[PDB]
Structure formats: C-alpha cells, structure tokens
Amino acid sequence: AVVKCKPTSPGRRHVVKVVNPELHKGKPFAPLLEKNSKSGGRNNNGRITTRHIGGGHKQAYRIVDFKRNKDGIPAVVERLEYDPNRSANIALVLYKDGERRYILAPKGLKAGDQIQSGVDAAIKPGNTLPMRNIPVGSTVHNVEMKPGKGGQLARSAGTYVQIVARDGAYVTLRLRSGEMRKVEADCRATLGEVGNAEHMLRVLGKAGAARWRGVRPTVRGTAMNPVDHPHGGGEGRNFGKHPVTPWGVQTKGKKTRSNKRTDKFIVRRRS
RNA sequence: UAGCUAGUAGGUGGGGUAACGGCUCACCUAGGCGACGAUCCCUAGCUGGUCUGAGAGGAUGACCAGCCACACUGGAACUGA
RNA sequence: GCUUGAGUCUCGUAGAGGGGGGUAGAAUUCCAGGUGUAGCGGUGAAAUGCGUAGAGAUCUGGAGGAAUACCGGUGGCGAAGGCGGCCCCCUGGACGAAGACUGACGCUCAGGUGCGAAAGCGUGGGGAGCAAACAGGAUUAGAUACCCUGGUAGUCCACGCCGUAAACGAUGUCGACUUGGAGGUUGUGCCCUUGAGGCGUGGCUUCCGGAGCUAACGCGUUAAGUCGACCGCCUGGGGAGUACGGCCGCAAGGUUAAAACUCAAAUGAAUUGACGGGGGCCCGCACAAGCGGUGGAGCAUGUGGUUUAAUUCGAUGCAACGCG
RNA sequence: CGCUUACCACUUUGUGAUUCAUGACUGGGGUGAAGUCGUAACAAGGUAACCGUAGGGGAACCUGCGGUUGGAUCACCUCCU
RNA sequence: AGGACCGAACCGACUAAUGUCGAAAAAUUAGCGGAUGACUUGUGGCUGGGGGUGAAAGGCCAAUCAAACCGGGAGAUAGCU
RNA sequence: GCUCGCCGGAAGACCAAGGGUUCCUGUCCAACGUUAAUCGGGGCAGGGUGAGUCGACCCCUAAGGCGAGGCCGAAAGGCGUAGUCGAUGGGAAACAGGUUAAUAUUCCUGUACUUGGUGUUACUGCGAAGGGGGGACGGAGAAGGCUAUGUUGGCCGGGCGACGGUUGUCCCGGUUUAAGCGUGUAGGCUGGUUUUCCAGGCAAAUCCGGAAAAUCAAGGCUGAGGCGUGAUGACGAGGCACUACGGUGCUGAAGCAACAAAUGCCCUGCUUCCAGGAAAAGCCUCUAAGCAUCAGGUAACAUCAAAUCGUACCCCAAACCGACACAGGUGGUCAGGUAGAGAAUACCAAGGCGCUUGAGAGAACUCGGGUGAAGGAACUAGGCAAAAUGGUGCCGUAACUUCGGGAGAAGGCACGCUGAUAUGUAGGUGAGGUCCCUCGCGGAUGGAGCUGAAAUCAGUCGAAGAUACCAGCUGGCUGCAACUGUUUAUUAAAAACACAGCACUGUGCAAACACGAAAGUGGACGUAUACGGUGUGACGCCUGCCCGGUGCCGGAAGGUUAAU
RNA sequence: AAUUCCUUGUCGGGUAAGUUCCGACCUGCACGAAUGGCGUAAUGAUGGCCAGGCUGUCUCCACCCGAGACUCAGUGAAAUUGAACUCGCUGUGAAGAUGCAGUGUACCCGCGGCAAGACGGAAAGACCCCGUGAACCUUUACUAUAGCUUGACACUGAACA
RNA sequence: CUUUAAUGUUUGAUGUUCUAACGUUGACCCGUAAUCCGGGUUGCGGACAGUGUCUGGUGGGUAGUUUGACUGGGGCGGUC
RNA sequence: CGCGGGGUGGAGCAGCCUGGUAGCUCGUCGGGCUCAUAACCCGAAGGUCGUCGGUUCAAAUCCGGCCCCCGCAACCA
RNA sequence: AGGAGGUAAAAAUGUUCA
RNA sequence: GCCCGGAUAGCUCAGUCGGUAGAGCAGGGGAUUGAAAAUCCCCGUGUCCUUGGUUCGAUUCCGAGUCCGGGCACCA
C-alpha cells in the first residue's frame, strides 16, 4: 500500500506511508515480550564506538523463534504483527500442543494458514526443514551456517536466497548481495520470501522522522577542523585530500575483507 | 467570446407620460435570454440607389432624395403645439 | 393499419474477438558436478573481448524471463489499433435455417464520451535474450556511422497517464441499382451417398478485366460506375501545422489555430532520352592465356615549366605531346 | 427665497482586464550571381526511403522500437525417374 | 493529521537604548523567534585530558580550553627585562 | 489606629530540594543593616519540632555501580556470571473540627481503616529460589456524565441611613459539612457455563494455553458523582458578657433550590494513526522435592503490636545557588469576582506589601516618557529608533504555483446604549403532574422555573462606539539557502551546520568499523529492502571531455628484492 | 555574478540627479555541471533596491511630567600619584615645554559646568621585527612508531600423487 | 656453447585426504533455579586459522624536531 | 653504489635471443590514380646505427671498458 | 517440372548564364 | 618612472654564422573563359622608431631619447 500524502505542510509533501491493514491493531503478546534497552552506541568503557546512534522511540523486544525446532507439529498462524526492531512483519503462530510463538512472516501468508516445522512438511511458504530435503532451486529465507545456530541469512523484508546447487554434503546459495557460499547441507531453511517487502518504497520525509528511528545527525567530514577529521581544515570549501574515514583508512575502494578462515566457503564473490 | 441579467422576467397596488409599459418605487413569485449564437470585442450611419456583372451575386452608400443621430466635451431642465 | 427498413425469440456453426488463472515443449543465458585440452569467439580482413585460475566443446541437473517451430494459407476474427502452443471459467460480435412477433423503434451526426500500434512517462516488481545512451577495437581524409565484442533504460506483468503513426485498400458512413470469369473461406437446400460428388441459394475475401468514369495511372458488384442522405475538411508554395491565448497533460508536448513577409512557382500522372556500385542477352587484345616492349640507363624528337632583348602562333581528356 | 434630502456629470483613491505604439536585447524565419565543412535525399544514392517517438552528435544526419510502400532485383551453381 | 498558523506559560536570544569602578564578572526596559515537537524540564547515572562530547564554532568539559584543574619533576630554561 | 498607593496565574497560601534554629518570647544597641533605631534574619538567656495511617527507612526493580568463583592484563587493575545495591518508578491503611507565643492529616474531641504475632471455635489438605494471571503503561483528538468553584433567588439576621431620594424590583453579611460504610448508577470491558482429552508451559500441575461436544442466554468485572449515613453533632453571622483593654468564657437562627462550569475526576477509558509505546515485587491461583492423629490454610471472635529517623522556619527568596540584606536563576500543587477567546490584560477579593537613606530646589546636561505648528527620510552607512497599522462578523482578494497555498493578500461595510420583534427569541438545562414496567439512582409524555447568543428595525448622545490595557505595517524587484530546526554560553544566529532525498564504496556474521595492551563489548539480541564510511543536500530538467599524475581494484610472466 | 583587476565597462528602465538596484550585451583578470550546474511555489528575527502609509529621524528644535544632576543632614568609597609655590606666547631642546631663555600677563581661595592639554588613567602593544622562544595545524620536510600487510622459524602432524 | 628428452638425485613449493594439535561468539548434559566460565559427549572446519620472535613494504593515524644569515624595518630578488 | 634495461633518418619505432637486409609509417619533391581535385598505392633523399678498442670471411646485433638517460634497494666523513 | 544452402571491398567533389 | 615585447611597403605581419631585405591582400596588367569565378605570373610595393660604435659590411651584438602592453608596487 504505497500511500502518498498530500502537501498540506512543509516536509509533509514527501512522506510516503506504507500501510498494512491486515496487521493486528491491538497490543502485542505479553508472554513473548521482554524489555530491550537502548544503548546510544556505547560499550563497556562508555565511549561512543558507533556514531549516529541515540534518542529514538522506546521499543520492546518481541522474542522471535528462529530455530524452528518444534519437530513435526502442525501450527496455525493466529495473526500478523508489527515488529519495531526489525524490517519484517512477524506472525503469531499457535501449535497443536497449545503453544504460541513468533516466526518471521513469509510472503505468501494470511491469518488462518497452517504450517509445520520438520523434515516432513510440504514445499510451501512458511514451512521449515533441513536443506538436504528441499528441491535444488527453491527459494528460502532465515537460513543458517551452523546446524542449529538459529537462522542468520535472509532475515529482512523481501529477502530470499536461492539454493543453486548441491555438492556433496554442502549447499550452494546465491545470496542477496550476489554471493555463492557453500553452507552445511543439514542447516535449516524456511521456504518462501519474507513479506512486508514494500519497506523499500518508504520515504521518511522529515529530519525528525529519522530522529525517532534513532538516527542522530551525521556531520560531514569537510565541515570540521583538522583535529576532528582527516578531511577538515580548509579556508572555504576545498577538499584536496584522498577520501578517508575518521580514522585514516581510505574509503571508496578498499576491500577490507580479512578473515581467511572462511575463504574456503566463498565459491564466487560479490560482483 | 460560453454562459449572461438582479428593477433584471412577470404579477399586484400607487404614481408618472400627450399615450401603453419597470417608465418608476414597495411587496410577492424565481424566473427571463441562449448553439436556427445570448453577452463580449472590433468595425460601421441605414436605404432608395451607384458601379460592375449575361444572370445570380460581389463591392459600395460621394453628388440628388427619405430617415436616424450630433452640433467644444458631458450632465440636467425650462420656454413652447 | 400494413410491409419489402430495422429490432427481438427458438436450434446450431466457424473463428489468433476480449479478460482472468494454471500448464507444457524447444531454445538462449547463468550456476554446480564429472569428462577433457589449447585454443574459443568474430569478420571483407583484423582486433577488442574470453582462456592453462583451466574456457569453448560434451553429459547430467537446476534456475528463471521472454517468445510460441511445423500447422500457417493474398487463411480467420475484430470497428480500428490489433489478435495466434494447450486447457478451464467469464463474456462480446457476426452468420445460416424453417417460421413467428413488434410495426419505421431508421440513418447520419458539430459539441460530448470511450477505445486507441509503437515510442515515451509516473508508482511498483521482474529482468533471459535483444538492445537507445555509453565503453572498446576497427574503418577512415574525419566516424561522436554503417562492421564487431560488451552494455543502463527499455522491450514483459499489475494500476494510472500519454492520445500520437505512410493509424494507408493514402479511398468517411448507410442504402439501391449496374455484363462475367478464375480461386480461397463458412453455413445450407435437393438429387442416386449410386465413388475423390452434381445443380441452386446467402455472408466474407483474392486476382483479372467489360460498361462507364478518370488528367493518367488504374478502380471496376468490397468501385474512383450511376444516385440519394448527413458529417469532417480543402481554396498556390514556403512561412507553418509555426506564434499568442485557451483547453488537456506530472513531464515530454498534444489539440484548436494566424499574421507580416517572400516567391510565381510548388504539385501529380505519364512519355522520349540519359544515368544507376539495377537486372537479362550479345560483342571487342576488354579481361582471361601468352610474347615483346614502356616506366629504370644514355640518346634522338616534341610538350609543359623556367628563362630570354625573341626564345613566333596553334593544338594541350580518350580525340595534345616524331602534331601542324 | 434661504436651508435641506434623493437624483447626478467633471474628478480623486485602490485593485483587475484588454489593447496600441515604444523598448536595450534576443530566438527562429524569409531573402541574397559565383565563401566554409561534409555529402543526407534522388538509381538498390553505395547502411533502402519515409512517417511516428526517445536519446545522441560541429552540420546534414545516426541508433533503437513499431508501421507503410511513396523500395530495386530475382539470374546463376551443388541434389531427384 | 500536521517538525501546520496566531499567540501566554516555558525555552531561546535578532534590534536599539541603558549599564560599563553596573543592580548584575552578559543583566534591565521596550519590541522580537519557537511555542504538539529534531519540544522543554526535574531527579539519578555514564563518557575525561592528546582524552571525552560536539546538528561541527577548533565551540564545551565547574566564570579557566588550538589541549582543563591540583600536586610533583622544579629553584625547568631565559644569549631577554 | 485612620485615610492612601502597589501585586493579585503574584510581590498570595503550601511541599521537594537546599540551608541549618534564621521560627517564638524577654531583653540589650558597641559591632552587623550602606542613615537614625527602644527595630530586625544582630548579641545574650529561655522556649519550641509529639505520627500504626505524611515522607524516608522498609519489600521490589530501571539507567547504572560493585561483584564469590571466572576470564584477561608487567603490578595496580579491567570486564563480568550467580548474586547484591540503586528511585525520579511499583507496593497496606485517616478525615473534619478545636487548641499554641511558636507544632499538628502528629496532641485533644468525634467518627473509621490497614497489615502481622498469639490464642479460641468450626471446617478444610497445605506446601517453593518453579509455572501462569495480574501489576503493566504510547501520541493525538472529540464527546458525554459530574465535581471543585461561582452567580442568582428563597430563607435568617442587622440597617432604613451625617447633601437631594431609599419599607422597597432596596442595602450588607451568612447560607459550611470530610474519610469510612451501604446501594452499584451514567458509561466502559468481556459472551458466560458444564464435560472429555492433549507431542505445550527446563519436572509436575485441577492454574494458564489448545482441540471438539453440550446448555442458556446473559452472567461477571470496573466505576467518578449522587442519594442515605457520618451529623436531633461540629462549625456558624450576630449577641450575651469580663478586659492585663492583646483576647477569654457562654450561647448561637438560616444552613435549601436553580443555573453556569473546568486544564480536576470517570480516563490505568473510547476512536484513530503510527515512530509501536519499563521491569520486578505486593496480590490471586496450581503444584514439585515433601509433610498428613500433624504442620499450615479459609472464616468469625478476643487481645497485643505497628518499631527508628525527619517533623520547628524559609522554599520564585535579606535564610537556596550568585563574595553582599544583589533589579539574575530555582522543579511541583491550589489559583476566586467583572469584562475578555484566554492562565493575555485592566481593576479588585482572600492574603501580603510601600521594595531600609530622607527633606528641600525645580539650572545646564543625562536617563525614562507625553505633545507639537509647515514639510514628511531632505537625516543617515541604512527609515536605527520612535510613529503608525492592530479585534470580531460579512463582502471581496493578483502574478505565480508543487494546485496545499500565495492569503488575514490588498482593500472596504457594520460595531456603543435603550426599546421593540419577544412584560429576554433560537437554543441549553429542567421540577411537579400522568402512564407503564423485567420496580430502580428507570424510561416516555410533560412543561413551571432558571440561564441566555446573535440578527433586524426604530430612537438617541458624543469629535471618536475594536473608544482603556491588549492588539499585524502593507505591497513590488531580486541574491542566497528548500522548509521546522542547530550553532560561536559571554562582540558573529548567517548564505554556515543539519536535513529527508540521490550516488559511489566497504561488509556474508567470529561482518565491516570503533573502545580496549587483552578479555570483552558497542555494531545488534540487527544480519544486504541491513549496517559503516564519504560526498552532495527538497523538488524539476540534467550531470559533458580526460586514466598522464595520485589513490584504489585486478593480472602478474620478467628485473630488482629483507630475514633465512 | 557572494565570482569582472581594468571600471563608477556599455545600453535600456527607475531619479531632477543613481559607484548601489533591476533587465540585457559577452571583453568569463580568474563561472561551470554531486568540492554539482541552471530554474523553483512556500518559508526567512537573512543581503541589496523601490513605493505607499506614517511620524521630531531631519529642516530647527520648543515645552512639559517624573528619576538623578544642585542645596541641607547621616553614612561614606574608587581608579591614580616622584616632589610642587601647577600661566600664555616665540624660540631652544632625546627634535610637540606648566618647570629652560626672552617676553607679555596674572590680587588669595571655592562652587557649578564643558573636555584642548597634562604625548591624561586602565592593559610590561595583540601591529612590525628580534629570540638559533613556545604552542598547536599541514604535507610527496627528516627520523621514528600504532595499525594493516609479506616471508622464514616455533605452536605444527600423517599420508600417497 | 644454444637448444632439449627420459631417468636418478637435491630442494622450493602445490593438489588431495585423514584425525589426534588447535579453533569452535554450533547442539546436548552436568557443576546449577545462572545467555559468563570450566569439563565431558558430538558435529563442522583443520595443520590452515590465530599468536610469539626475526624481517620487507605502506604508514601525518600518533610523537619528537628543523625549516640560515646579511638586509638603509621585514618578505621577495641578490649575496655568502 | 652495483645487479637490470634502453640510445637508430628531422621526430617517433621494428629488426637484439639466430650475426650477412639499414628498414615500416607522419611530415616534404615527384610518378602515377581519375576527364580533373582529393584519396589510397609506390620509388627514391636523409641516420659517424652514442664514442673508442676489438674477436670473425663479414657487425646495430654477440663481445670489453667507459660518457649520457630512468626504476629500484641502497649511502653514518 | 516443384523448392531450399552459397553469391563482390573503396568511388566524397564539379562555381553563374545560355 | 622601473623590470620586460615590438615599430618593416597602402594595411596586417615574417627574419639569431653579422651578408645590401620577403608574405598575403589592397591597385594595375597578363595568361584565363563566350562573358565571369577560381588560380598563377609580373610590378610599384623600403632611413628596418630615432640616434651611436667596431667592422669588408649593421635589422641583427650591445648603449641611450620616443611610442605601445603585461607585471615587481608586499603587511602595518
């Protein structure tokens, strides 16, 4: 629902609201609610390790089941929700044994669906099962690298991964960035792309709109003095230096990929 | 040039004119005109006739004559049939 | 009142007519695994690019998006644009048959409304191949062209907008009449189906031509023939389908639509010629197959150029230059 | 008669519309015996043309998409009774 | 609905005068801007000296900041007064 | 003591904070107060702070801190698990009146409530650092129902009046009443009830959750205010009475109704949008390891206990922070009358003050203001400053445009008072009566009373009817920046910064990057529609040529090439 | 032009008069397309210009009401200063004389005012220079170093091609 | 000597496989009601990764410093 | 400083590992080429092959030593 | 008779009138 | 003013062993064609700013007067 506003006031004219009429309007489910402390971007020492973080709206963390290890138990999707600290909608599922859980909402979804996690479920949106049972070529999400880690990749709006090939006990995935990383074949994956994919079409419109998301203003480099930023200085607007980070490392073209304990898993790299 | 008008469309009563009438006031009705062209803008005295043209028309309206209008510009009124 | 107008009902037929949803096969591109080795790819030739990290080629499997081989036909349908692998649902139009019914409800139509190829545009997805812009190699007097290796938007789908084409049989629509032949296409009637059939009756459509018309070319029962009904539009060319304004459009612009000026032609058909890196037949020491020369050396002779008091004048593509 | 009320022309104030000249300067166009670059169209104009549309380029023009004919030409050579 | 409008509280600090051994080591008076938000404010915590924080002025970090304050090197050094 | 003037959404009356006896009385006047001083926040002595219900302590928890073991680091020390602290948060219980020189929801009178210990009686299964429910919550907006409170009338009491009138539609004062208990309303929330079963809730579970049948239609919960009661009580204007003449004692009528109405309460509601809105304990309930003639629990009753600290005074200021008895700053609550949209403003009430140097004079000059003939920016760096416009309703309103605006454009008309329309209309509220009923705080009908716009007409006064305080200057051209916003605290508020938006680039999770010798954290309990860095800075049309230099990405065969 | 040295360039409008303003001409000292270019409705305690209204801003000030200034009583400072019996003038002079020379002039002492001087007071000039002073800042200045990165050895082994 | 073919041999490396070192911010159990940690099963990587010592390169991110004198003031030019 | 590499008509660049050939193109003269211009296609000028010495039948080449350039590690009077 | 595979690179320019 | 670049035919401009001066167009003629164009040839096109010296010879190599442009002309 790409609802574009009308220019009634300055700053309002560019606000495009993505509304979801099927989302539950009521309060969240208390049993799965746990507080989520805002950090401001400070660590143990208290220093600001990451800039541009602060303020924003208070929000509560809704524990999400990523593991999907309730082996062989049908469950119906009670309702669709809104999760602040995430780009994707979350669904409240109810199992046959009478237990409620939060799973990420896939694309082909609707309140009244029935899913089930395990190595027997049908190749259909929402079902979870190991990757060595799925047809090679199927599109999944919420996959992992460790057999039971919980689910790492493809965890945002409209995000999916395509199981490209099966080599031995490893599965090649064409990632969102355009990678091709082999992951352990026994890692779980939830079929179907993640819904709420119109998160991209949204435009905040105001400077304050970002301020309640928690994005404090980013000060440009060439606006400071020489002591603050390796760009700084200048009489009146002149750069004359090579674009670097606040800490000398040259940005715009410096592949800092350095782990080497994982280059054995990357078949094809981002291009 | 696509809508225009508000004493403006009509009725009633008084008044007014040599005479009828919104000609003019008061009240009531909300109508009246309009694509077979209203309002607006530009232009222009009209006609008998004149010139031309085989005819039909086209252009035109000076000299003679009929009529309307004007008399430095605009407004009002009297005298008097 | 009636009926030869027109409209409606009953049964069926043909059809890429239209919308929505699944599905299928071949091929292309990409990716993974096995096999396997120096080329692959391309052109007028070459190169860029791809490759010994192991391509291309080959086999297996998967992934997607787009377009539907043969059927296929100057075949069919639709108002036109335009529409074709298969299947279901929803639905529009036309046509034939033996009858009936209503009884002119008809036709046309400024304004107005809708649809309206492609390209393009906004919002959102998708994105194989192909491919504006762009990059590189060539070609080249120059190549911001044609050729070739890649390539963003786009081309496709949903909802709006745009409203324009050589949107063209350059032919408005409706109705009537006006010699025929040769095919295709779709109903239908009768006779012996006595065999790939024979003879009539309607719709659509292709080709050729008679009358007649037309400037000619040609149209020619789907007419540009003979008539009637109503509408749009045209009044020399360029200016210009341009300006100003209005109206519509997010934008690109569209639409309605001049004047001054300048020229006195512009234009169409057709014919005699010429020409064409158009075609066909034919011919030549033209080529082809050869022999000997030329151009390289010295020299004779003529011309141009230079020079000179004059170095007479002419001739000066082939067709001047041992010529006068 | 004077005073006074309604009516009322010249005129003033503010805010629109329309139109005539003028206006530095500028875009495009018409026009002009022998200037510059290239050669786009006319034959198959040497990449067929043209129309519609977008982008591109010192200039005509170029490329992509769709459409039309107001495009020419169909002979020579390998297979089969 | 609104980083919407006018406008008190509240917050801020554009103009002018006053004040400048002041009432005050940046205030007063008369006018100003924001005033449902990127708003303001109370209480309690957290980040620290070549470090913190900074809608970025080299501004702020206890009336002190192009590197705070306190103590110690240390009676630094001074070709200068 | 009598007049006078000022504040009155404060200059009033109270808490937190923070001070620390400044509070009250007697007395003293050197020093302190910018003057005098029998005066005082000054000196001296004495007096004063009374709590089961207020707050803190207490129980629990946030940000965050410390941190047994543990990990890491030359040492110091850093981080952090179990735990243990930490309110500005959550959790039991009281109100009215009187009294002091000074204290009081703290003492006294009266009337109540809450949480535990122990004991008695009758029943019944109780029982965790464990589970579930609850606690438990966002912004904005509108309405309805009420109350604080105010006004008016009736009623009671006093007056009838030093200059004209005033026994009457007259004047002044009063007309006060809480917590608790009972009813359970306006309104809101949720469909109740029984049975069987179950891969769920680290174990178990009758509790919560889930799946099918059955039964009836409502039950249950929450809930301001009102009405009774509290209360034939207190209070209460005014008198009766003694004065150290400051005040004490005694007594004490009326004490209702109507209307208006909050930012207070219902509201920890309802509608809606999105940026999606603490935690734990108290409390309720079910069981595990267990304990069952027990122990405990439920209900009623009796008795006992409710400890310790603060409590005085100031709290928009001479008592706090500013060196001062300083024109500055300081969070929260209540906040009346008339006019008014209003917590603006003006004048007043309650209440509190006249700011701790005054008396004369009436020069220049200065500061703060008023008015000004004629002209109206000629002043001047510049219309700086003053002046002016200033409100509500109606009419009317351009270029341009992102079609919202521009715009309150501009510019005009009417505004008071009286009467009439109408012995105050429309409207709002609304008693009695009548009827019915699943009978209560009910619903229709009904209309007295009360309150009360605005519009039109007529009349009238003045120079002026938005008459005061209050309260836009408008228009045109154009540069720059989109806008709200932020900044040099204390000479620069801007075109600077930010900004949503656009783009390139880095990053595949043990992520990049950052703090940190390290561990570990932040990034993020996020994972490419995500995060970091950089540049530009809405929106519209676009963004051209160049790879030598430098940086970067990639291919490395050859040359050079460290340690070894 | 927030950019044009020459320059107040040239032309047109505006004014009686216009180094500014506004629209253009290109001679761009030395604009230029994300250190973004050119437009742009609205917004602006923003920059420049114009007109109306309006006034003491001004022509040229006049008057008046209050708080000071003044007088009396009480309390009672401050910056500063070598010592003073502390005049003008011309000249001299470490080069601008209250103090020297010459000369004129001038009874001693207060109060209210005004500011030309006492190179008046305040701040051991911040301008300029010096110091083989300091401090931060920059970089393809020198020498180092955190970090990132390369190779050898150790933690670190077994096998066949 | 230039150029080359098989083999033996001396070393640098590469390919692949394995599990025992090691890593493990994978799952499970226990210490324990505790996402730290430690240990034990087990899975996945695997002699890599990562760390130490020596060493080359880059390195204004950070630190310590130099950056002449004469001079009709100083800078510039010139000079020594 | 010592392992590398490179010097060619007036400029630009092959012949360098293999000794015998001084060329391929831009620019200038000419010849054609066409009817003519231009364009392509050709044959010559013009290089002490950096200088000196020297193995061989014969030198740009393989060889020597030294002047002149540009890239590295270097260099503590 | 009936239908398919194969089929040439470069060539710009020529002033006014008759 | 000084550091620097030039004055050349009618006009605009070439030119560094130190060697008696050249280009195009303008003007005229000729070839030119039918008349023109286009193109070539011919000719006049001269104190080489002015003023000096050495020299076989001076525009040239250097000094000084004139004329025309770009820059030292920096801070306080």
Ligand SMILES: *C(=O)[C@H](Cc1ccccc1)NC(=O)[C@H](CCSC)NC=O
């Ligand atoms: C030169 O301009 C210096 C710089 C300066 C300005 C202001 C204060 C201090 C220094 N001007 C002065 O030194 C002035 C004199 C100006 S005369 C040209 N001195 C002030 O005290």
